[PDB]
């Protein structure tokens, strides 16, 4: 239930890493080559009304910020080409209450 937090994961041979949860919803951290550094909420659900409006800074452990309504349709949200292509991800998130949950 906590109203944000931070999390990192930790990639070796260097696409999820485990859940953090947040204002009762898991948020997880995916990496991709084409690096993309996208921050993932609650993907498990087959519910379809949920939101959460939330904030957060990506880091490589340098950081970069996004502001997104994560609902249905668009539950993850972060860069494509964070950078340029083991090595540690750090994401802040602060969230407000979800509203249809």
Request: net charge positive; aromatic share 18%.
């Amino acid at each position: 239930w906590r109203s944000e937090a931070t999390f990192q994961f930790t990639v070796e041979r260097f696409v999820l890493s485990p859940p953090c949860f947040v204002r009762n919803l898991p948020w997880k951290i995916m990496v991709m080559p084409r690096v993309g550094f996208f921050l993932q909420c609650n993907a498990e659900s087959d519910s379809t009304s949920w939101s959460c409006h939330a904030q957060a800074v990506l880091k490589i452990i340098f950081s970069r910020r996004i502001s997104h309504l994560f609902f249905h349709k668009e539950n993850d949200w972060g860069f494509s080409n964070f950078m340029a292509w083991k090595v540690t991800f750090e994401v802040f998130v602060q969230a407000d209450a979800p509203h249809g949950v």
